[PDB]
């Protein structure tokens, strides 16, 4: 929508994910404008509490970027994802965590 840029979303672990070993689940949102944005981390279909985020910054094209993160432990059974809401989106967007992405 013009001066409004939809965010790119990357969900991933800080360290190579090994089942049972504590780690950090990340959701990196970039390329978006305006800065008002909502990012949730999801576990097995429910919101994760205690999700922190970096300080709002922007790139050369003035589009903003943020890192959302919280501690987590990858397992065999647990499904993790990010859900991002923005003015550019008609629905909240869900991006599931791919272990090798």
């Amino acid at each position: 929508m013009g001066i409004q840029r939809t965010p790119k979303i990357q969900v991933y672990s800080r360290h190579p994910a090994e089942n049972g070993k504590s780690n950090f689940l990340n959701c990196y949102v970039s390329g978006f404008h305006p800065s008002d944005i909502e990012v949730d981390l999801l576990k097995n279909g429910e919101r994760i509490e205690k999700v922190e985020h970096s300080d709002l910054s922007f790139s050369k094209d003035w589009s903003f970027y943020l890192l959302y993160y919280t501690e987590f432990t990858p397992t065999e059974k647990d499904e993790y994802a990010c859900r991002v809401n923005h003015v550019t989106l008609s629905q909240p967007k869900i991006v599931k965590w791919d272990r090798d992405m």
Partner: nanobody
Amino acid sequence: EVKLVESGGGLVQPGGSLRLSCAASGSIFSINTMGWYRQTPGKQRDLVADISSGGSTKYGDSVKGRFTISRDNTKNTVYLQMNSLKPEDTAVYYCYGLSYSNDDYWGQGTQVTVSS
């Protein structure tokens, strides 16, 4: 297939109250979080309230203290008690659900109009 059936939308005076309801069909244990977003034309849909199968609840800032969400897992139904409705609560209210694999589902939405 999971379907989200909503009811309760309509017209209400400012300061009044309305009770929305949403039942999940086609599944009895597939859906974890169920809740409500609201949307006016042209903008994003904002979280109103949602609640997991374990009772973990979250409210949007603009409805905290006035709205109460509740849930009956045995028939997969959520309830939205909307108290002290202002004209700014006028929007389409979408029920939604999350599977335990983070698959989202959405209802058709109910229009809620607060006007004197």
